[PDB]
Chains A and B, each alone.
Chain A
Amino acid sequence: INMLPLTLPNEMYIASTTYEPRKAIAVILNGDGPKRFDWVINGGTFWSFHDPRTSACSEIVDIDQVEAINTKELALHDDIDEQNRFSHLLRQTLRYQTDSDLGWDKDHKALYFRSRNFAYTSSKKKTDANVVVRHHAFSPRFELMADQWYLIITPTYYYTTNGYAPHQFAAPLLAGKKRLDKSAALRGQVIMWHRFLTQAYLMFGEPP
């Protein structure tokens, strides 16, 4: 019910190089072109849903060893190390897609907003509160069940003094705000995150 039906693209650009994922991000931050955050950490290959010909530099790999394949044969793969790599690539793609009005945690791994009421159009009652300090965040998790990939949604709060300074001892207050659920406080948050995600290389469906 909280789970989210991702829809995969039809093409996957792959390459083979011998680089390392630190100096590669170093050159991609000191580059002079469009920066992208969905190119995957080099576990031996280079997988993305983007053409490297129109990228900033693409000096990680040489041009003649780039291939394009279909994502159906790669999404249905066993030997779950590749499944972990696919979840890695999907996490970087989601972090790059909704990257403008969002921030990614390093410890608790959530996507916090960065006061905005954020009213959204719905047929039910307008239950909108402060989202940008009591934030609203969620931890995305990728799981492939039966024939379909899926995102697991988990709401949480990220606390900050002024939006930039980190929290200090707001964890018991976060736990106390978590301990509040009467079948309205979680379904509304799931509805809000679905409405935000429905509005791009990954298409998000309707949760059950």
Chain B
Amino acid sequence: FETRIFDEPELEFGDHHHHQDPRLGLSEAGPLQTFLGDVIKIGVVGNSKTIEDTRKFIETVSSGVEGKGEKHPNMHPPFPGLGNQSPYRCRFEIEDGATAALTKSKLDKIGKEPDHYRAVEMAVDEIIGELQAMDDGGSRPDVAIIALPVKLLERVWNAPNFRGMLKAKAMGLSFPIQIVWEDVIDDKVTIPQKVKESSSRKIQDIAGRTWNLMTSLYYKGSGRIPWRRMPLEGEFSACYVGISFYREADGQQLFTSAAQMFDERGRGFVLKGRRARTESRGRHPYMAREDAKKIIEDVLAAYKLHHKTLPARVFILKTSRFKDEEADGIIAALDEAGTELRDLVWVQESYTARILRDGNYPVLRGTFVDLHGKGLLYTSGSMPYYGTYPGKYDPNPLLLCPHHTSESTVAQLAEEIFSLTKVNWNSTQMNQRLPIPIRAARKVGEVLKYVGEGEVISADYRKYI
């Protein structure tokens, strides 16, 4: 069993300051597609206290946040605001006529509590009515913040899913919503939990919280990736694809398929896929050819629509072992498209064998031991740059089987997904464990459950993230 270690790939922003940290490499570098100064308009929905708190937060973060950093103070820089030392080279702004407000009578009508469906859909409709008033007005916002009040939060929390229907109705709009709880805008009252009743939810330090929220606002408003994943030694335009299977919330066991692409530098495309038949547990909604061929053809159609070319490498990775009919369909479609390099890997969030315990420090982030046929990828770990392991106990590997084998070995696959791990947009945290086509599965399922009938499904991960 041969062993090796791996180092994390560097991140490129403006062809300067090749750094691993997504926060320090934003603070002291030139971020991607920067300008001399840009304005991003925010829109807020909620009662007047939430709007006042949101405006106070937005106009107080520009002064500066502390940067003490008790555990490895290079984990985050002190946030200096978006003034002269702007980490995104912009200046945020909020329009006066953009921000909305709902009266107490409608909130009490929601809080009448008939059951946990009617109040939920009434609050949903009213929110999209306020959002349509936002959109049809003159002050159109780039990113909308839904800072719902604590009473409506408890009315939603008394239980469907509010978030799924909210994103399903906002998919037909022009701006992506950026729902943020009222505790997150510096309010002294903590939100009550669901099961533990008389308990207070926890939250990070203020500086890292502001860093994550402001970077998420930066993506959701400005349509531009912050950090790119520059390729390794000898790569081309690949088509990293994950496949997920979800069950609807109306009591139907139809394990419907999806498809997610993260081809160019981290840009993602979410496609609906085909129907769902023949699942005792769920392994083949790619039955024979009639689903898999035209699902891959639709994937290549989207790739031809954007890139006006064809992918050189396809790296279909999932978590459930496939069958011979699905493999035959994938191989036939890729041969009809003339694909050069292919891989069909199933990745295990399982395989209880935990090894390489030696050494005084815990095991490093990135370490490959290749069992004779299958690899043991350690994607979460520790570094001397971060000093220690501030996480929890022992990390969890993944094991990769190239079922229906192809023209690649396991070292290339392990190095590729260890390049693929830290291109995460929901977080600027460094120690990540899952590839983004795998982590995106739950996030796209929780929204695509509630689309329902046949409409324009569209393809943008910005709605789901």
A interface with B by C-beta (< 8 Å): 1-3, 139, 141, 145-146, 152, 154, 178-179, 181, 183, 186-187, 208
Residues of A within 8 A of B353 (CB): 2-3, 152
Given contacts A181-B393, A183-B360, A208-B1, contact A2 B355 (CB under 8 A): yes
- Given the known inter-chain contacts A146-B373, A208-B1, please indicate yes or no for A181 contacting B394, CB distance below 8 A: yes
Known: A145-B374, A146-B373, A154-B352. 19 other contacts (CB 8 A): A1-B355, A2-B354, A3-B355, A139-B352, A145-B371, A145-B372, A145-B373, A146-B371, A146-B372, A152-B352, A152-B353, A154-B354, A178-B393, A181-B393, A181-B394, A183-B358, A183-B360, A183-B362, A186-B357
Closest to A184 in B: B357
Residue of A nearest to B355 (CB): A1
B454 at the interface (CB under 8 A from A): no
In the bound complex, what is the Cα–Cα distance between A187 and B1 (angstroms)? 18
B356 close to A (CB within 8 Å): yes
Q: Which residue of B lies closest to A154 (CB)?
A: B352
A12 to B462, CA, bound (A): 59
- What is the CA–CA distance of A40 and B371 in the complex, to the nearest angstrom? 30
Residue on A with the closest CB to B1?
A208
Bound-complex Cα distance A2 to B357 (A)? 10
Quick one: which of B375-425 are within 8 Å of A by CB? 392-394
Task: Using A1-B357, A208-B1 as known contacts, say yes or no to A179 and B393 having CB atoms under 8 A apart.
Answer: yes
Q: Does B359 contact A (CB under 8 A)?
A: yes
Pick the most buried of A1, A152, A179, A186: most chain B CB atoms within 10 A of its CB: A1
Q: Could you name 18 residue pairs across A and B whose Cβ atoms are closer than 8 Å?
A: A1-B355, A1-B356, A2-B353, A2-B354, A3-B353, A139-B352, A141-B352, A145-B372, A145-B373, A146-B371, A146-B373, A152-B351, A154-B352, A179-B393, A181-B393, A183-B358, A183-B362, A187-B358
A154 to B362, CA, bound (A): 19
Interface residues on B, range: 10 to 19
A145-B373, A145-B374, A208-B1 given as contacts; is B359 within 8 A of A183 (CB)? yes
* Chain A residues whose C-beta falls within 8 Å of the C-beta of B354 in the assembled complex: 2, 154, 186
Question: Nearest residue in A to B358 (C-beta to C-beta)?
Answer: A183
**Complex contact B352–A187 (CB within 8 A):** no
CB contacts (< 8 Å) of A187 on chain B: these are: 357-358
Task: Give complex CA distance A87, B92 in Å.
Answer: 61
Within 8 A of A (CB), among B298-334: none
Chain A proximity of B280: nearest CB distance (Å)? 14
Residue-wise, chain B 195-227 has the 8 Å CB interface mask toward A (1 for contact) of 000000000000000000000000000000000
How distant is the Cα of A141 from the Cα of B1 in the complex, in angstroms? 20
B residues in contact (CB < 8 Å) with A: 1, 351-360, 362, 371-374, 392-394
CB nearest neighbor in B for A187: B357
List A contacts of B1 (CB < 8 A). 208
Bound state CA distance, A184 and B355, in angstroms? 13
> How many Å lie between the Cα of A192 and that of B423 in the bound state?
42
> What B residues does A139 contact at CB under 8 A?
352
Please name all residues of chain A whose beta carbon is closer than 8 Å to the beta carbon of B373 when the two chains form the complex: 145-146
| Closest chain B residue, CB of each to CB of A151 | B353
A154 / chain B contacts, CB cutoff of 8 Å:
352, 354
Query: Complex formed: what's the CA distance from A2 to B372 in Å?
Result: 16
Which residues of the other chain, B, contact A208 by a CB distance below 8 angstroms? Answer: 1
B360 contacts which chain A residues (CB < 8 A)?
Answer: 183
What is the distance, in angstroms, from B283's C-beta to the closest C-beta of chain A? 13
> Least Cβ distance of A113 to chain B in Å?
20
Determine which of A3, A145, A183 lies in contact with B357 in the assembled complex, contact meaning CB atoms within 8 Å.
Answer: A183
Q: Inside 8 A of A3's CB, which chain B residues have their CB?
A: 353, 355
B residues less than 8 Å from A1 (CB atoms)? 355-357
Chain A min CB distance to B405 (Å): 13
- Report the minimal beta-carbon distance from B410 to chain A, rounded to whole angstroms: 13
Q: Which chain A residue lies CB-closest to B321?
A: A80
Minimum C-beta distance from A204 to chain B (A): 16
Would you list the 3 A-B pairs with minimal beta carbon distance, nearest first?
Answer: A146-B372, A1-B355, A152-B353
Cα distance A145–B394 in the bound complex, in angstroms? 24
Chain A residues closer than 8 Å to B392, beta-carbon distance = 179
Please measure, in the bound complex, the distance between the C-alpha atom of A208 and the C-alpha atom of B358, giving whole angstroms. Answer: 13
CA distance A19 to B200 in the complex (A): 59
**A153 (CB) vs chain B CBs: closest residue:** B353
A181 vs B371: C-alpha distance when bound (angstroms): 24
Assembly CA distance A202 to B355 (angstroms):
24
**From residue A22, how far is it (CB to closest CB) to chain B in Å?**
24
Q: Complex Cα distance A208/B362, Å?
A: 19
Residues of A within 8 A of B352 (CB): 139, 141, 152, 154
Closest-by-CB residue of A relative to B363 is A183
CA distance A3 to B393 in the complex (A): 21
Min distance, Cβ A126 to any Cβ of chain B, angstroms: 20
Residues from chain B with a CB closer than 8 A to the CB of A2 are 353-355
Q: Please measure, in the bound complex, the distance between the C-alpha atom of A1 and the C-alpha atom of B397, giving whole angstroms.
A: 14
Chain B residue, CB-CB nearest to A208: B1
CA distance A181 to B393 in the complex (A): 7
- A109 to B371: give the CA distance in the assembly, Å: 26
| B357 cross-chain contacts in A, Cβ below 8 A | 1, 183, 186-187
Shortest Cβ gap from A53 to chain B (Å)? 39
CB distance from A87 to the nearest CB of B (A): 14
B374 contacts across to A, CB distance below 8 A = 145
B219 to chain A, nearest CB (A): 35
Docked Cα-Cα span, A3 to B357, in Å, equals 13
Q: How far is the CA of A1 from the CA of B371 in the complex (A)?
A: 11
Q: A141 to chain B: which residues have CB within 8 Å?
A: 352
A187 to B394, CA, bound (A): 14
Shortest distance between the CB of A80 and any CB in chain B (Å):
9
